[PDB]
Design a protein around this nucleic acid. Structure first.
Ligand SMILES: Cc1ccnc2c1NC(=O)c1cccnc1N2C1CC1
Lengths: 530, 405
DNA sequence: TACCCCCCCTTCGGTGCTTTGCACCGAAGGGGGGG
């Protein structure tokens, strides 16, 4: 009751509410009028604007919400259960009518005005408001700060109304202490059920079953339909993403591959055998429940990483072997061209960010890569990157680069001169090349851009070459793509080029400026342009 | 009194989120902020405050205690009208020829002057929690912040008052102030330079500026681009060098390449050696002579902004270029560590921006060759400076990287 | 006929050189956990 009130004002430049009155039928009026008059009589409540009446057998506002001082959110993040320390005793106390106890400010008491089709002004903080959670949480933590200051050994979490209190004192001692917590909350005019109405483990918080010694995801149900629509597939993939946090080995890429190219949410699309195998394996792994473990401050975090294929990675953060704390998957496709080392880098940095926000400290990785491969990748790459601290685990498949470009030219190998000139308008291109030994070739192409012909001229040269070859290109695009050393791409042409480059035992590339008459590159212009 | 501070006409405030921190850099922040609040520096703020700015904990050079560092780039962009227009100071051009400049920290000096009441609702921050276990402890500054561009502007009057005696006693040195940093430039020997530095330290301590490391602007050498030398040139080497004198034609009008192409008329294998003709040799010599001469047609313009590119050259080597307009460079450097990978980029960034402050006075907007997530995750662990530039990440540079071999 | 929050996925726009095509990142939609 004697709680300090946070002042609140409306948005500068406008006024408060302007919604008109909302008369309705007389059937639903009294059923709300009596209870409203009762809560007015209790004393918690006691100007052209007014609020329309909402009857449920509840006050709603949108103009006010849009014309209110903006606030700063108090709980933006949700505590993942993996980071909670192993508390021996846990108790839940659900405060009731919490928003009734929190008062309102003198200025805003005038603005809050509800009139039934009798008018009252809120002398307490209303519900369903934009500012309600921040104000209520601030008041609640102000109330609870003296108790935590006086008692350090207990741990208390406040989520909206519910409060979860953990302790290492004995069961009788824990009940004793929770009694003074109840009394302290009652002193500040906040209700709390006695020991008869208190909840028992497992506690179902935000989709998590919580125990004194283990955590688990709430029972996840998968749809079982002979045919699947768009919304059913989306619900599926969402539930699989949600459930991946504790069940190892779940892949959802194939299922997601169906959602493309369509926009209608009521359409029906037949599956594919790859998606059928995905579903079968997902159901097989989801058949039996698994449980996490609670963190211990004195143990060393370890986060292994494993590969699935086509750009899926799984990880299992744990401290004691065969006792997990968290699992997850990474499948984002960043960039139109990438290889496995870059994706391993992205997965490692994502894991570090999650472990920092959840546990506060970076774990010791165990990557499926060799030291020499990493070293040779980082030193020879244009960008800068650092993997914190990792050891080597020999669990195939491993990560390695397929084709290594050579720094120096090759003796005894042919030297191709490739280019390509495609008209922007007629969509007709020509990919040709010549060789130092006299071999010449030219190929017409239909419906290609001015870069496609130049890109697959290298493909022509590689296809018509031997194991050792030197190639001269006059476009920076293809040179950059090939030097990036990709393993996959959006377009299949780059995949063909990669397949050719893997076969060659030694390949060398070289850029040459164009449209100047430089060397033999001027010769292929006569073959490809006219 | 308190100098009134206002933003631009109808200019909004700092709305930036605080990304997570290590548990050590949160224990340290909690301890430092409790110490600061227990004697009046900071005051907790209620939920009605709608503005937030990031916060970090670093470790200063050759120190053990932790030091708070509050990012203020957004607030500085808001406030730029209050500092650039109101108190646009002149930059001492004599600081770029000093024998050796010493850097001292005067941020503590700002820990006494109060701050405007109306503006005080913008310097609000929050220390985060581990696992979102609890809502974060929030705070705002009462005294002037260290990191805001207007705080030097407010303290400038007292700074000049304190520095008039020392400047009058000895006019040889040059005094500059940027954020919490004071640069002192002397043409004196290092042995007596140390004595002068300790004398200035005592002078600052006497008048109430408690303060508990040397650059050599005369030894800062620009790096001209130089072609390689070899007795025998193959086709590949000629092709490499020719295009480099074609890209460099845009940078220098005096580079001509028409005779170096006379050696490349027909399809020839890369490995085969090619002799050098007299006209081509003359063209190569002239191009080398032009490359020796410095860049032409460039001049510093304080109205515009500086841009700094950094490229990784391998084996702990980095290059950097500071300019204002494309293909019109104002500087060129080469950092080297004769460690980590992000650590070297962080140190290079600090060196480049310190040099930019010493010569020009405004830090450049960096174009970093790093992953954005990797930078934002790792940049704090190796940052010992008490100020932060603005950086944008560059996806791809011209592939030749002609700046070094 | 509400919001707000964290996560994961596909889709569109705008801007930059990697040029009139391609690439990139942030914004939107849709699911999941809710209060
Ligand atoms: C929902 C929730 C959020 C944060 N922490 C907890 C809980 N609830 C628990 O039941 C719990 C279970 C195990 C360990 N800590 C727990 N607690 C902590 C307070 C002791």
């Amino acid at each position: 009751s004697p709680i300090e009130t946070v002042p609140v004002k409306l948005k500068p430049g406008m006024d408060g509410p302007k919604v008109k009155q909302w008369p309705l039928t007389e059937e639903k009026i009294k059923a709300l009028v009596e209870i409203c008059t009762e809560m007015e009589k209790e004393g918690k409540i006691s100007n052209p604007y007014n609020t329309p009446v909402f009857a449920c057998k509840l006050v709603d506002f949108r103009e006010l919400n849009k014309r209110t001082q903006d606030f700063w959110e108090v709980q933006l993040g949700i505590p993942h259960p993996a980071g909670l320390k192993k508390k021996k005793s846990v108790t839940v106390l659900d405060v009731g009518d919490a928003y009734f106890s929190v008062p309102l400010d003198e200025d805003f008491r005038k603005y809050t005005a509800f009139t039934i089709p009798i008018r009252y002004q809120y002398n307490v903080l209303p519900q369903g408001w934009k500012g309600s959670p921040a104000i209520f949480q601030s008041s609640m933590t102000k109330i609870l700060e003296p108790f935590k200051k006086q008692n350090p050994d207990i741990v208390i979490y406040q989520y909206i109304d519910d409060l979860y209190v953990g302790s290492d004192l004995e069961i009788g001692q824990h009940r004793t202490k929770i009694e003074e917590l109840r009394q302290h909350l009652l002193r500040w005019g906040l209700t709390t059920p006695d020991k008869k109405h208190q909840k028992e483990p497992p506690f179902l918080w935000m989709g998590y079953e919580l125990h004194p010694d283990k955590w688990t995801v709430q029972p996840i149900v998968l749809p079982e339909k002979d045919s699947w629509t768009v919304n059913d597939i989306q619900k599926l993939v969402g539930k699989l993403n949600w459930a991946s946090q504790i069940y190892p080995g779940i892949k959802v890429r194939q299922l997601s591959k169906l959602l493309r190219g369509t926009k209608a949410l009521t359409e029906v699309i037949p599956l594919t055998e790859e998606a059928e195998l995905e579903l079968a394996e997902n159901r097989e792994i989801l058949k039996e429940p698994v449980h996490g473990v609670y963190y211990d401050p004195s143990k060393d975090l370890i986060a292994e990483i494993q590969k699935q294929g086509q750009g899926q990675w799984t990880y299992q953060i744990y401290q004691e072997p065969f006792k997990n704390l968290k699992t997850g998957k990474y499948a984002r496709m960043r960039g139109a061209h990438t290889n496995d080392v870059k994706q391993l880098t992205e997965a490692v940095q994502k894991i570090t960010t999650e472990s920092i926000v959840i546990w506060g400290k970076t774990p010791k990785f165990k990557l499926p890569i060799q030291k020499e491969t990493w070293e040779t990748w980082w030193t020879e790459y244009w960008q800068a990157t650092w993997i914190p601290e990792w050891e080597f685990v020999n669990t195939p498949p491993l990560v390695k680069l397929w084709y290594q470009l050579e720094k120096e030219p090759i003796v005894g190998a042919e030297t191709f001169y490739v280019d390509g000139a495609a008209n922007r308008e007629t969509k007709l291109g020509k990919a040709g090349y010549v060789t130092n030994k006299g071999r010449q070739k030219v190929v017409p192409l239909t419906n290609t851009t001015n870069q496609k012909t130049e890109l697959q001229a290298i493909y022509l040269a590689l296809q018509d070459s031997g194991l050792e070859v030197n190639i001269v290109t006059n476009s920076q695009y293809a040179l950059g793509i090939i030097q990036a050393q990709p393993d996959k791409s959006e377009s299949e042409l780059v995949n063909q080029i990669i397949e050719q480059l893997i076969k060659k035992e030694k390949v060398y590339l070289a850029w040459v400026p164009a449209h100047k008459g430089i060397g033999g590159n001027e010769q292929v212009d006569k073959l490809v342009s006219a | 009194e308190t100098v009134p501070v206002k933003l631009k006409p109808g200019m909004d405030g700092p709305k930036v989120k605080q990304w997570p921190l290590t548990e050590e850099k949160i224990k340290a922040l909690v301890e430092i902020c409790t110490e600061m609040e227990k004697e009046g520096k900071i005051s907790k703020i209620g939920p009605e405050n709608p503005y937030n700015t990031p916060v970090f904990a670093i470790k200063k050079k050759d120190s053990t205690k932790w030091r708070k560092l509050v990012d203020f780039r957004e607030l500085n962009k808001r406030t730029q009208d209050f500092w650039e227009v109101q108190l646009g100071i002149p930059h001492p051009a004599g600081l770029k020829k000093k024998k050796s400049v010493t850097v001292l920290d005067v941020g503590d000096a700002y820990f006494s002057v109060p701050l405007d009441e109306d503006f005080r609702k913008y310097t609000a921050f929050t220390i985060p929690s581990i696992n979102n276990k609890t809502p974060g402890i929030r705070y705002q500054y009462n005294v002037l912040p260290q990191g805001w561009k207007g705080s030097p502007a407010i303290f400038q009057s007292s700074m000049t008052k304190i520095l008039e005696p020392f400047k009058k006693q000895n006019p040889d040195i040059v005094i500059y102030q940027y954020m919490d940093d004071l640069y002192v430039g002397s043409d004196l020997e290092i042995g007596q330079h140390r004595t002068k530095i300790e004398e200035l330290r005592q002078h600052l301590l006497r008048w109430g500026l408690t303060t508990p490391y040397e650059l050599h602007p005369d030894k800062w050498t620009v790096q001209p681009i130089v072609l390689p030398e070899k007795d025998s040139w193959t086709v590949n080497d000629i092709q490499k060098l020719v295009g480099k004198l074609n890209w460099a034609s845009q940078i220098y009008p005096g580079i001509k390449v028409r005779q170096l192409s006379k050696l490349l008329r027909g399809t020839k294998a890369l490995t085969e050696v090619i002799p050098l003709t007299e006209e081509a040799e003359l063209e190569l010599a002239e191009n080398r002579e032009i490359l020796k001469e410095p860049v032409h047609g460039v001049y510093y313009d304080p109205s515009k902004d500086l841009i700094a590119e950094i490229q990784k050259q391998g084996q702990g080597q980095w290059t950097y270029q500071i300019y204002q307009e494309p293909f019109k460079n104002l500087k060129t450097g080469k950092y080297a560590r004769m460690t980590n990978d992000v650590k070297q980029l962080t140190e290079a960034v600090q060196k480049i921006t310190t040099e930019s402050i010493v010569i020009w006075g405004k830090t450049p907007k960096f174009k970093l060759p790093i992953q954005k997530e990797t930078w934002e995750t790792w940049w704090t662990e190796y940052w010992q400076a008490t100020w932060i530039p603005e950086w944008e990440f560059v996806n791809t540079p011209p592939l030749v990287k002609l700046w070094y071999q």
